[PDB]
Amino acid sequence: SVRGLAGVENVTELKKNFNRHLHFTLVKDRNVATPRDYYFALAHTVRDHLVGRWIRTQQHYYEKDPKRIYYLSLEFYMGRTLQNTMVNLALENACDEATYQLGLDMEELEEIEEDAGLGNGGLGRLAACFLDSMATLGLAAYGYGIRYEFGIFNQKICGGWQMEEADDWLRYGNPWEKARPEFTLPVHFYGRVEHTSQGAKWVDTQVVLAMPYDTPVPGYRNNVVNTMRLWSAKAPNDFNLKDFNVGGYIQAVLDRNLAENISRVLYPNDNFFEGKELRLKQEYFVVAATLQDIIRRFKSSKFGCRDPVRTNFDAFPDKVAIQLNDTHPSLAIPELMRVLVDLERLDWDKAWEVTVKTCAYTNHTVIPEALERWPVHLLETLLPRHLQIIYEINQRFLNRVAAAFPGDVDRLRRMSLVEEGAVKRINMAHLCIAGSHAVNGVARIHSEILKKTIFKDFYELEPHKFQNKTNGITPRRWLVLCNPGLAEIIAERIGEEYISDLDQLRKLLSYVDDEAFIRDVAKVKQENKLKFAAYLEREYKVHINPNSLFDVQVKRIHEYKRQLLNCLHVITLYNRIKKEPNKFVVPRTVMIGGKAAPGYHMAKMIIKLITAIGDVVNHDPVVGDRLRVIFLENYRVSLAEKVIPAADLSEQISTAGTEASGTGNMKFMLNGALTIGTMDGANVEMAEEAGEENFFIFGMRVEDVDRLDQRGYNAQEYYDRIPELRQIIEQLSSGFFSPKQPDLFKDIVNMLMHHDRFKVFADYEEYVKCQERVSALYKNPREWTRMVIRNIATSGKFSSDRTIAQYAREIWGVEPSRQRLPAPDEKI
Amino acid sequence: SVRGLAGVENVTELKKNFNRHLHFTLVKDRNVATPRDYYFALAHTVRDHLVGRWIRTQQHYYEKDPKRIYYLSLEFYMGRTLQNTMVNLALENACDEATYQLGLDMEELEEIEEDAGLGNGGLGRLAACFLDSMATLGLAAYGYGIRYEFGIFNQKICGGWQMEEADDWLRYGNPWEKARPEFTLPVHFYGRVEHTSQGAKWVDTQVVLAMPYDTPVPGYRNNVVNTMRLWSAKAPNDFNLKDFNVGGYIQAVLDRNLAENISRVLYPNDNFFEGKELRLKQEYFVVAATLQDIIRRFKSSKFGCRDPVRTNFDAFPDKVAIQLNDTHPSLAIPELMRVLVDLERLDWDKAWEVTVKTCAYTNHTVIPEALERWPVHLLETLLPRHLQIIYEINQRFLNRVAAAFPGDVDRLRRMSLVEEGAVKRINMAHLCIAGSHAVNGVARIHSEILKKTIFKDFYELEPHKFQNKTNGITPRRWLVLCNPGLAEIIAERIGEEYISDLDQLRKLLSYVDDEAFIRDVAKVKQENKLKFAAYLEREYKVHINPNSLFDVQVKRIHEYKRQLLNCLHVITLYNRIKKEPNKFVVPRTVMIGGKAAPGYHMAKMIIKLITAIGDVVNHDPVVGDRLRVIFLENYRVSLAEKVIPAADLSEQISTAGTEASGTGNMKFMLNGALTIGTMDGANVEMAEEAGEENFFIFGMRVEDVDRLDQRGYNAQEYYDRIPELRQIIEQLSSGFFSPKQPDLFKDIVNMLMHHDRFKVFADYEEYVKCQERVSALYKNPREWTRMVIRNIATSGKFSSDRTIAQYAREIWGVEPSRQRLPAPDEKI
Ligand SMILES: OC[C@H]1O[C@H](O[C@H]2[C@H](O)[C@@H](O)[C@@H](O[C@H]3[C@H](O)[C@@H](O)[C@@H](O[C@H]4[C@H](O)[C@@H](O)[C@@H](O[C@H]5[C@H](O)[C@@H](O)[C@@H](O)O[C@@H]5CO)O[C@@H]4CO)O[C@@H]3CO)O[C@@H]2CO)[C@H](O)[C@@H](O)[C@@H]1O
Ligand SMILES: OC[C@H]1O[C@H](O[C@H]2[C@H](O)[C@@H](O)[C@@H](O[C@H]3[C@H](O)[C@@H](O)[C@@H](O[C@H]4[C@H](O)[C@@H](O)[C@@H](O[C@H]5[C@H](O)[C@@H](O)[C@@H](O)O[C@@H]5CO)O[C@@H]4CO)O[C@@H]3CO)O[C@@H]2CO)[C@H](O)[C@@H](O)[C@@H]1O
Ligand SMILES: Nc1ncnc2c1ncn2[C@@H]1O[C@H](COP(=O)(O)O)[C@@H](O)[C@H]1O
Ligand SMILES: Nc1ncnc2c1ncn2[C@@H]1O[C@H](COP(=O)(O)O)[C@@H](O)[C@H]1O
Ligand SMILES: Nc1ncnc2c1ncn2[C@@H]1O[C@H](COP(=O)(O)O)[C@@H](O)[C@H]1O
Ligand SMILES: Nc1ncnc2c1ncn2[C@@H]1O[C@H](COP(=O)(O)O)[C@@H](O)[C@H]1O
Ligand SMILES: C[C@]1(OP(=O)(O)O)O[C@H](CO)[C@@H](O)[C@H](O)[C@H]1O
Ligand SMILES: C[C@]1(OP(=O)(O)O)O[C@H](CO)[C@@H](O)[C@H](O)[C@H]1O
Ligand SMILES: *Cc1c(COP(=O)(O)O)cnc(C)c1O
Ligand SMILES: *Cc1c(COP(=O)(O)O)cnc(C)c1O
């Protein structure tokens, strides 16, 4: 497969260093090495071929001094690194050969790597796809985040209920990171602010040290390897036993842990805000440690000897760009001001223009519950200087507003960064727009909406700032790595250039009429379904029918994502079957899966509904093969890599106006799945690219929702004029799915019936009719696959390479390069 | 120096892999490598030459199935590993050459290694010397202990007061250990005991997992490399979020730490008991995890297929011997019974004979405060089954006693393992004697005393059990590694066989009259003093006079060790000078140093006294060079390696009957220092070996102390008939040394005056007169060095190789081998 070359000499070196690391690094012997030990041996042999490059890329940036881009995210949803590293480094087929001559099956070894799930969902995956695309366009980019000791929890279902277990991902080691204790930085917490003479001094602070760990991010076949720097918290060795700190020496040492708890776990809220102080400590910890590392490179490169100005930050935006990934690092704006004004003693106005020109903010949601307004009482306590600075910012911001909208007192009310009233809080989004020079939404519809609805005021004050950059996916992991079959057949026809130029995929339009290509496309699909169907029973217990339509919705469980509507589709189907049982119907294996944040009662309930449905449906003998509903336990990046290649239908059903973009979207459009969806997020652009006719669009569009809201959405109307929906609601209410606890799903019936913000029932009739259109087309193999080819041929625009090329040009001001950097290494 | 060979080919391979690890393992570049990075690069290159051997020694023990010896200690005072590994592996001069051709100075690199101070003092150093000697006699020995995240604290003096800081020794990594997460074992805590039908079941327990980390222990030049296995505590991934454990998911994850706190720090009590539950948790944690690893090797070796008996432990003592190092692992006796009786279902009597024949206990102190009596209320709670077993043990033990001493009710009272009265507690020492087959003291005098005083009852019941094994020191680290000069000059004359046969040192008796040898001996001494004097000012600030008598007492600060008496010697001297200031007196640089346990008020006070004295004395202009008193900050194994080669006088002044052996002793006897000491611990045997005349023995002997105690020790008698002592006590009381806080040393004057158990003042007159004899002899260079040669020639018996050869033969039943094992490695 062209997975590259496979080459006698390299095969021989690879074998040799696999064995060098088994012995010397693992200190294991072939007589007692387990597959885990072979995985480590191989990981560490691949790692070695990337070091030369890593060291050369950073040496190279040092002397060539480019504008560096720092991407700040509190999530990086990396996934497994091995195969991806082999892909981007071209080692895949050399190693496959070598591991077979050692006798090992490489793919068994890949399954032993545990995902780095340092992320919840799409926000963190974006950052990881971004990372790959910044390396592939050779940008000097660095992604800074926290090294959580426990990442997102592992979901285990027991009784149809999510049982969350900790993700002890570092348990056996991580052969990719390189701890860098030489560069530990202190971060200060609490303190008081002494305003005396020269300025304010943040004094009496508690120190937590941030210890960096670097991971390499290899660009695809272009020899650039950039760095992902993740901080760890470490308690100071001195103050935790200094002062006249008696308490108990032994307790003093046991108390170190409290400071280290800043990097202990990722907060599992799948965008929704939580005012917890340890989260605020994380968010400040990232920013402070990172910005010291930013200032440190600025002062050392080539300004390294630029002598007699003072030291000067006029050039700081031409050498630094930092990208705020959602508001979670907005303290970079008051911390950058704190450093510049209080420490380098710049004039506030100068410092502010350098800050605005460095910062940029990406907004991910319109949903209010996810927005961060931190209580000013907490900010006062933990970070008093930053509260002062925010207050001063706000001041001057509002004075700018006053002058522009003379007399509109409510504008001042709306636009203030401080939300007055009862518990006065600080709106992080407003901070970000006030101090960034560019603000972008992630899909064009989400950016129009940001300009009309929530930030309209800021749009009117500074229209110039508002931009859009539709999200994207990296074809390497999302095509080449999870679906090499499709990438091979595509490559036979149009070559391999498309892996770093996805737009070339549209030359496949010439093959929508090619019968060999149709056979091929459908064949990779059926093979993938077979490989997944087997996974399903070999790691769990299943018997699914592989010639079903594999209908799947995998994403975080939430009510706007509307898994419930899909649930409503399933029993309508089960019941349609159940009433005229000898009617032919196209078989569907509906798989729905995703994690639910602990505590979100409703999402935990929705999960039980799906398993409840599966319990009934999957054991009704009158259904047979015809419907299988399966809930996919513990979704994460490695399950996404197995289920999206096997999927036929992609469920993307948000009430129009709630999904910002959606990136799962895009992953199924390559991989040949057909989308059923509403016009929301990026589904709009995927349908423009492939054409309305090659998409199954149903549902109300945004206006229609707003029309309904001004009328008054009343679910009772639906219930009363739709009999099928009424039978479902009755089954749910009677305990048809909960035989021994009828009472159970009344909670969900209640929200559906009475206070459902996401208007599940108004989209139901269209949903169901549109689903009959999907089965109509699945019965004609040839035209489903032609629709599929037009979808695949058209997903080029959803590559993150395009997205980063746009961020680069229209916001960071840096130009992309596909120019390969020369790196081998030394050999002397 | 013959430090071995230095050899063109090996020099070339070493350079090459130093560079392989700088690049590939450290991912650093010569352009940015710091000395720390070069230390890691070198450590990791030495490490590589030991792996072949390690793997071969364990493969070899596997098939050759010997009786394995497990040494259980809760302390292992390792020190730095690099140079020692080079010594024992013969790589020292190959690397010195290689690092010079790379341009680096090896000795700068050795100073960057941080001590593994997993120990307090002599108890833990013993274990580490034992480890080296078991490897050198090729015994299949394993040392099991805890991997503490923080070892003994680092002492920092501020104001003459000890300020203790945490020892963040793992901060930059430890290139020697090999984490072994494949072998994590659970340990159970709390629980209840359900006695039903077949036996008792320990049920409902909390699980902590013990995760092993192995370190290699290379024998000197004989290619055996044994293993030191240190456990780490890890919290279970399931129960810390299972049950219906709501609390807060995020708190659940933050609570993992509590279980991990079992391996967080070493308890800094420098033998003295502390009834703290986390200590009991450590002690049980070691034993349970270790014994599973012991049972595991027994059941797998060659009994691995010994089929149809059941599985049988009759051969367990012929294949296992575990050595209890002080009572801190005595739970191995109830845990071995718990496993055998409750889990393998053996008959209690059979299980007991296998237990007694496996176990052996080494007793280290007669001092009551150090003995562990655990409160039975704590044992009930944390370990209920083990309390039952201890009770049953006790029963049967006392019934054995009753039958042997019919009617001696008080014997039953004295000998019970359970100390009744108010807080009923369990005497660990009695447990150990009851269930071990051999019990030994560590110096012959300490064993006679154990038989007469504290365990006389147990002696009379089982005389056969009581043995002695005088402690020893390993000539490799304590001669070859800290003092290669002396080892070279010794080697020129008598060859190198003495490094694994220290008794050969006595052929040096032929050179007590050799003038070249005298010049040589004294020359290495003066050079060593110069190297230490320079250390002293380059890392601190000092100007000491190098041609002084370097009089030094370095050991843990405690009142029985009597640093106070030495303090009394110093101001007598300062005052003698001060009254007739133009008298010649032999200059002395008195260095006293050692850590004091936090909390031991008196030891913390004694430290301030010494610095107080130094403050006065060292700045009196009428003294000049004549007296320097210096307190050596932060004593540990690497400072011992620098100060004992430079020392002239070795202070070993315990009230006779309190030091068990003392091992510091021995270190100064090689290295050419002359001992001033009482007849206590092993000073008795060092004086038998070198002869009374070559030792400065003063003080009362044991009888005399016991005579005094029956009279009534009254310090006032001394005060009143000795004027010098009276002036000192007055200076202390008046605030002569504490000008601004006179009140300050009255605490120490009070204990001296009124309740001094260690009878400082009764030994004073002899002490001082004996010290005048030492200065008399230092004025005649030639005969001090001849005395020195007779001391050095005689320290052969204090090698730990002898001690382990005796443990081996008279207790473990295994024979030593100096036979080299063949190990290179593979090369194919
Ligand atoms: O040296 C400069 C300056 O420093 C000091 O000013 C600071 C204040 O002392 C300090 O309290 C803080 O002020 C905050 C204020 O606490 C916060 O609530 C917020 O004020 C906004 C309201 O939130 C906003 O609603 C609006 O109030 C209007 C509202 O627009 C209007 O629609 C209607 O509903 O009536 C409301 C009542 O007037 O505007 C105000 C601001 O005008 O923001 C404030 C500024 O961040 O921070 C100040 C800046 O450091 C000194 O006190 C001052 O004398 C000095 O000149
Ligand atoms: O199936 C066997 C057996 O099991 C059960 O016996 C157990 C007891 O129920 C249980 O309490 C526990 O007994 C302990 C006892 O608690 C503990 O205090 C200790 O008893 C010693 C005294 O400590 C010791 O001083 C001495 O008492 C004498 C003393 O020698 C003498 O000098 C003088 O001063 O008078 C004292 C008062 O008599 O001896 C006793 C023991 O004789 O040790 C006990 C044993 O460990 O553990 C028992 C064993 O499991 C059942 O209760 C019993 O009926 C069954 O036969
Ligand atoms: N002081 C310097 N002299 C030469 N090269 C340097 C220097 N400082 C940093 N570099 C190099 O540039 C790299 C990038 O480091 P950093 O600035 O920490 O990301 C290093 O690993 C070096 O190769
Ligand atoms: N008990 C709670 N803990 C955390 N989030 C909650 C809680 N109650 C409501 N929310 C949230 O508000 C949202 C809607 O949940 P619901 O209240 O069940 O409709 C989600 O984003 C939830 O996470
Ligand atoms: N199952 C086995 N078959 C062959 N060799 C073994 C086996 N089990 C243990 N050994 C070997 O003996 C060693 C010592 O292991 P251990 O018993 O854990 O100390 C291993 O590293 C192997 O080389
Ligand atoms: N406050 C205390 N904490 C710990 N050990 C103590 C304490 N008080 C007395 N001891 C001990 O009893 C011993 C003698 O100390 P002292 O009471 O100062 O004479 C030492 O081994 C001490 O560690
Ligand atoms: C917060 C969020 O994640 P999620 O898919 O988990 O809801 O960020 C992604 C990346 O910008 C978006 O594609 C997505 O619509 C949005 O909801
Ligand atoms: C407990 C102890 O340590 P220390 O030297 O720290 O007091 O064990 C050592 C080894 O058995 C003995 O030599 C020593 O006399 C004894 O006191
Ligand atoms: C692609 C991906 C997502 C994004 O899915 P959405 O439906 O856009 O939220 C989330 N989680 C994982 C594991 C993914 O790989
Ligand atoms: C040798 C040694 C000791 C032992 O000294 P004693 O006076 O016997 O207690 C203690 N600590 C260290 C650092 C040593 O190397």
Curated annotation (Swiss-Prot), chains A, B:
**What is the name of this protein?**
Glycogen phosphorylase, muscle form
One MF annotation (Gene Ontology) recorded for this entry: nucleotide binding
UniProt lists the family membership as follows: Belongs to the glycogen phosphorylase family.
- Broad enzyme group: transferase
Which PANTHER family does this chain map to? GLYCOGEN PHOSPHORYLASE, GLYCOGEN PHOSPHORYLASE, MUSCLE FORM
Q: Look up the record and name the cofactor or cofactors this protein needs.
A: pyridoxal 5'-phosphate
Annotated Gene Ontology cellular components are: skeletal muscle myofibril
Q: What does this protein do?
A: Allosteric enzyme that catalyzes the rate-limiting step in glycogen catabolism, the phosphorolytic cleavage of glycogen to produce glucose-1-phosphate, and plays a central role in maintaining cellular and organismal glucose homeostasis.
Q: SUPFAM superfamilies in the record, alphabetically? A: UDP-Glycosyltransferase/glycogen phosphorylase (SSF53756)
User: Per the UniProt record, which EC number(s) apply here?
Assistant: 2.4.1.1
Asked whether the keyword Acetylation is assigned, the reply is yes
- What's its catalytic activity? [(1->4)-alpha-D-glucosyl](n) + phosphate = [(1->4)-alpha-D-glucosyl](n-1) + alpha-D-glucose 1-phosphate
Question: Can you tell me which residues bind AMP?
Answer: 29, 62, 296-305
Highest taxon of source: Eukaryota
Q: Where is this site: Involved in the association of subunits?
A: 95, 129
Lineage, broadest ranks: Eukaryota, Metazoa, Chordata, Craniata, Vertebrata
List residues, modification Phosphoserine: 1, 416, 500, 733-734
Activity regulation behaviour: Allosterically regulated through the non-covalent binding of metabolites, being activated by AMP and inhibited by ATP, ADP, and glucose-6-phosphate. The activity is also controlled by post-translational modifications including phosphorylation.
Modification(s) after translation: Phosphorylation of Ser-1 converts phosphorylase B (unphosphorylated) to phosphorylase A.
Q: How does it assemble?
A: Homodimer. Homotetramer; to form the enzymatically active phosphorylase A.
A GO BP term, please?
A: glycogen catabolic process
| Site entry (Can be labeled by an AMP analog), positions | 142
What gene name is listed for this protein? PYGM
- Name the UniProt key words of this record, in alphabetical order: Acetylation, Allosteric enzyme, Carbohydrate metabolism, Glycogen metabolism, Glycosyltransferase, Nucleotide-binding, Phosphoprotein, Pyridoxal phosphate, Transferase
- PTM-bearing positions, type N6-(pyridoxal phosphate)lysine: 667
Q: Which residues carry this modification: Phosphotyrosine?
A: 190, 213, 459
